[PDB]
Design a binder for this molecule. Structure first.
Ligand SMILES: Cc1cc2nc3c(=O)[nH]c(=O)nc-3n(C[C@H](O)[C@H](O)[C@H](O)COP(=O)(O)OP(=O)(O)OC[C@H]3O[C@@H](n4cnc5c(N)ncnc54)[C@H](O)[C@@H]3O)c2cc1C
Length: 525
């Protein structure tokens, strides 16, 4: 019998499989529905870390195919369609397909988690784990940093910036923003070279970091790839194993404990199908209720995104071409919208220039939002995706933050060092920026039209989280405890980005690494 079966070999599942199997007495099985990414055969599209958007132009090869979601909250006089939502389907999960940025968020984010009932998940309690996971090439020996972890983090040298990037920075300086240098150990508004994870020009996923050749040869670790868990197996209120599809064949496998690291949209769907969720919803689908847990699939967080682009004039294109650090991430900006004094640093913006598409861009998202959505089952079938409604801009403060970020962009590009380029900025969808949205100067004059545009075209940033949240032991809406144990049943944990009580002011991969490090420690202790 396996001591632990870990469902989903993504960012969190890779950490857990590594940490739990470091103890030889623990017989660990890691099960991953997608392909392996062993060192001698990382797909080229995955391996190219300088072009980390490439997986998304390779169709659906590396994702859960035809996984669609509803995005913006339903709203009169706006029609919404299902949208494809990339989620990694291969060893490494999101770390194998993502944009390679590695950032922590802010102390306030984690202190809030503890305030919301996740004891020991305050900044003091998560920082050790952010240290453990990393080797920071720039600041590794400094306080608040690690120099020995499996995941490298570094930044481009400021002095390698293109002349266009420098112009952007002079605009931000005219706004009183500093260069903060290290977004992972300095927490006020400003701009910085983004911290990212690469091994030279190669992507370095959690599978390369935690499931390396030596870990893989541990006799107590088993790795099943191209193997899909369909159901959790139960004995009374105890989870006691899994059913696994391998090609055409189904296998039943016993487990002393199952740990779900199947991703924020899929871990809660598995809970629902097991009978762990809102009792009336489960009754409705004829699923016997093991535990009436109304929070399962609720509390769905994301970061709400939009873009602004402009054709590069000659001077912008020339200036954009002088960077000495290639197509690495150059510039990030942490800013405050002013919409709610409770949420400083609630916007993340990037300003940059791409000779290839011919576009300058200012893309941004609400990094500390107010809106949450939910997911529920469509039916009881193991092959169904859940019905997902991110419900973006349900809370009007998030609309307000989008408008503010657009006004900020206006302000920055009116500064002389950006104004000299004579760019004509226009709105765009965030995910694949392109022509077709209205001029920024024009839309801002039309508040009705501006709101309609945003409700129509608001995007996410693939930061789905919170659908199986940590919460207090008496909290009817909480799903797991401080060590990931699912309330109402035994033998079952969740240990992925599902468990976040709120999304941090951060891209979610590094917070995911951290929380999986922390949960592994709790298990082991
Ligand atoms: C396109 C994209 C770009 C992003 N950009 C960044 C970025 O630049 N920086 C950043 O910090 N974050 C960003 N993120 C987010 C980040 O990568 C994820 O938040 C993180 O990977 C979540 O980790 P996880 O372990 O919760 O889920 P995942 O890494 O998604 O892992 C879940 C794993 O479970 C497997 N699985 C699911 N169901 C089953 C089943 N039934 N049986 C077996 N296996 C199963 C999946 O195939 C997958 O490998 C990005 C995400 C995407 C998709």
């Amino acid at each position: 019998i396996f001591d632990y079966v870990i469902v989903g070999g993504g960012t969190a599942g890779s950490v857990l499989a590594n940490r739990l199997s470091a103890r030889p007495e623990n017989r660990v099985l890691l099960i991953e529905a997608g392909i392996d990414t062993p060192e001698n055969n990382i797909p080229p599209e995955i391996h190219d870390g300088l072009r980390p958007w490439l997986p998304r132009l390779s169709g659906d090869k590396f994702f859960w195919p035809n996984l669609t979601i509803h995005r913006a909250a339903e709203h009169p006089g706006i029609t919404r369609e299902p949208q494809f939502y990339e989620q990694g389907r291969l060893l490494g999960g999101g770390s194998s397909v993502n944009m390679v940025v590695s950032n922590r968020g802010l102390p306030r984010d984690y202190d809030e988690w503890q305030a919301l009932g996740a004891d020991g998940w305050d900044w003091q309690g998560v920082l050790p784990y952010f240290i453990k996971t990393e080797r920071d090439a720039d600041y590794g020996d400094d306080p608040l940093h690690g120099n020995a972890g499996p995941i490298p983090i570094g930044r481009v040298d400021s002095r390698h910036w293109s002349d266009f990037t420098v112009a952007a920075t002079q605009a931000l300086e005219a706004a009183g923003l500093p260069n903060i240098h290290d977004q992972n150990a300095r927490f006020d508004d400003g701009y910085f070279p983004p911290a990212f994870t690469l091994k030279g020009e190669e992507r370095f996923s959690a599978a390369r970091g935690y499931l390396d050749a030596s870990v893989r040869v541990r006799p107590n670790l088993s790795l099943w790839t191209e193997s899909r868990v369909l159901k959790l197996l139960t004995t009374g209120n105890a989870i006691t194993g899994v059913s696994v599809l391998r090609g055409r064949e189904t296998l039943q496998v016993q487990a002393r404990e199952v740990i779900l690291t199947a991703g924020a949209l899929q871990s809660p769907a598995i809970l629902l199908r097991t009978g762990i969720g809102p009792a009336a919803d489960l009754h409705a689908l004829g699923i016997p209720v093991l535990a009436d847990r109304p929070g399962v699939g609720r509390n769905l967080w994301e970061h709400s995104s939009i873009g602004v682009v402009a054709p590069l004039t000659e001077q912008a294109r020339a200036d954009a071409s002088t960077g000495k650090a290639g197509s690495r991430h150059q510039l990030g900006i942490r800013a405050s919208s002013g919409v709610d004094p409770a949420t400083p640093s609630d916007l993340f913006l990037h300003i940059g220039a791409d000779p290839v598409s011919g576009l300058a861009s200012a893309v941004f998202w609400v990094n500390k939002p107010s809106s949450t959505g939910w997911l529920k089952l469509k039916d009881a079938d193991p092959f169904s995706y859940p019905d997902v409604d991110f419900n973006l801009l349900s809370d009007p403060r998030d609309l307000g933050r989008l408008k503010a970020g657009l006004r900020l962009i206006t302000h920055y590009f009116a500064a002389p060092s950006l104004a000299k380029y004579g760019l004509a900025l226009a709105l765009s969808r965030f995910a694949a920026p392109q022509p077709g949205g209205p001029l920024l100067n024009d839309l801002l004059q039309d508040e009705a039209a501006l709101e309609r545009y945003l409700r129509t075209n608001v995007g996410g940033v693939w930061h789905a989280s919170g659908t199986a949240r940590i919460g207090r032991a008496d909290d009817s809406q909480a799903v797991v405890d401080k060590a990931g144990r699912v309330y109402g049943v035994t033998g079952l944990r969740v240990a992925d980005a599902s468990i976040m009580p709120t999304v941090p002011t951060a891209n979610t991969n590094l917070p995911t690494l951290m929380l999986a490090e922390k949960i592994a420690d709790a298990i082991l202790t």
